[PDB]
């Protein structure tokens, strides 16, 4: 996939802000409904997610027409080292105020 660094970084930082990713299966959506300010489409979002799933950093669930990727711990470490985040900040799903 030929997505740029900024798009990849935004896609990863959404997963780290919260350890889930919901995406409609539509490669022709001009913008993802969330993070539409970065102007990256659902095609790039879902391809980045499939790369993460094939590398084992996320669990993929598919209902009717949507993906519901769940971040794993193997993905927690990978996103930590990729985004250079300190070993103190965790997603809200991983920890809620505690």
Partner 1 sequence: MAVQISKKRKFVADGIFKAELNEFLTRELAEDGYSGVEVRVTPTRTEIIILATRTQNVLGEKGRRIRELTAVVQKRFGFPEGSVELYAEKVATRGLCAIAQAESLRYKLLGGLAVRRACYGVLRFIMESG
Partner 2 sequence: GHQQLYWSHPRKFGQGSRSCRVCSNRHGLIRKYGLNMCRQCFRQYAKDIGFIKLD
Binder of partner 2 out of 65, 84, 96, 98 (CB under 8 A): 65
CB of 8 to partner 2, least distance (A): 19
Q: Residues near 70 by Cβ (< 8 Å), separated by ≥ 6?
A: 19, 20, 58, 59, 61
**Cβ closest to partner 1, residue 84 vs residue 98:** 98
Our finding on whether 86 is near RNA (CB under 7 A) is no
Our finding on whether 2 is near partner 2 (CB under 8 A) is no
| Window 4-33: contact mask with partner 2 (x via CB under 8 A) | ---------------------x--x-----
Binder of RNA out of 64, 84, 88, 96 (CB under 7 A): 64
CA–CA separation, 39 and 37 (whole Å): 5
Pair 33, 26: CB distance under 8 Å: no
Query: Closest Cα partner for 94 from 78, 72, 77?
Result: 72
Binder of partner 2 out of 5, 37, 64, 84 (CB under 8 A): 64
């Amino acid at each position: 996939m030929l997505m740029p660094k900024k798009n990849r970084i935004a896609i990863y930082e959404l997963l780290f802000k919260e350890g889930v990713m919901v995406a409609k299966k539509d490669v022709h959506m001009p913008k993802h409904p969330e993070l539409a300010d970065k102007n990256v489409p659902n095609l790039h979002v879902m391809k980045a997610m499939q790369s993460l799933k094939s590398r084992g950093y996320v669990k993929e669930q598919f209902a009717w027409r949507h993906f519901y990727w769940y971040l794993t711990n193997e993905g927690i470490q990978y996103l930590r080292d990729y985004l250079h985040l300190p070993p103190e900040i965790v997603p809200a799903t991983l920890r809620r105020s505690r």
